[PDB]
Ligand binder design. Sequence first.
Ligand code: B8S
Length: 218
Amino acid sequence: LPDSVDWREKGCVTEVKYQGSCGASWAFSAVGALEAQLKLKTGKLVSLSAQNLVDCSTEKYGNKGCNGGFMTTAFQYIIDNKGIDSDASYPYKAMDQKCQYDSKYRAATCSKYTELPYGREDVLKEAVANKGPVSVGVDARHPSFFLYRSGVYYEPSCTQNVNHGVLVVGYGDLNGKEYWLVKNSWGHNFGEEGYIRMARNKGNHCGIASFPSYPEIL
Ligand SMILES: Cn1c(=O)n(C2CCN(CCCn3nccc(-c4ccc(Cl)c(CNC(=O)c5ccc(F)cc5)c4)c3=O)CC2)c2cc(Cl)ccc21
């Protein structure tokens, strides 16, 4: 129940990445979540390969690389593959390539994941604070989202149907307006040094709590 959290303060969050024209938000959200679990378990912060997912977690996992995917099935891949690579060994090139996974350069591992219940921002607050950063889908289809610079983001035409993957690294409030602290993979020059604060407890605003999920290492 702590009023506000920020996983950057605990050293569990990597640099803000840049997905470019390639629509791999799902991959970045997934690697982002795990990065923290890797830090909580081993004390090391290393950026995990988003490309490894784009190239290797494909048809079998209902994913289509640069044309979208799911964080849930990405975790499944990492479990099935018994590991993921470091971004340094398998870097991001913003396009669909052949699977080039090398276990020699295995950076981390995943044991299971957990899909949090639909639209429950209270449960999402619990997970974020107790378990760590949570991969979520949101409705980023509107210009206001692209244009976002600062403060608590609220779009009245935003639906609960999610198309874009992001990572909830914290929560809190600004002048009474509650927010979710979301790391976005759209470069450092998006919003607040690559982050966006989005309205919290305003009826699952933009589908933030629609499909939340987090991995775990054991
Ligand atoms: C082929 N295949 C699947 O597609 N799934 C599933 C993959 C995901 N699940 C979970 C449904 C929950 N959910 N519903 C709606 C929207 C999202 C969602 C969450 C985050 C983001 Cl970023 C997005 C956006 N993704 C896309 O727009 C997108 C995804 C894939 C793609 F190819 C193109 C676009 C959606 C979600 O997770 C259902 C079926 C399978 C499951 C099994 Cl056991 C076996 C084969 C499967």
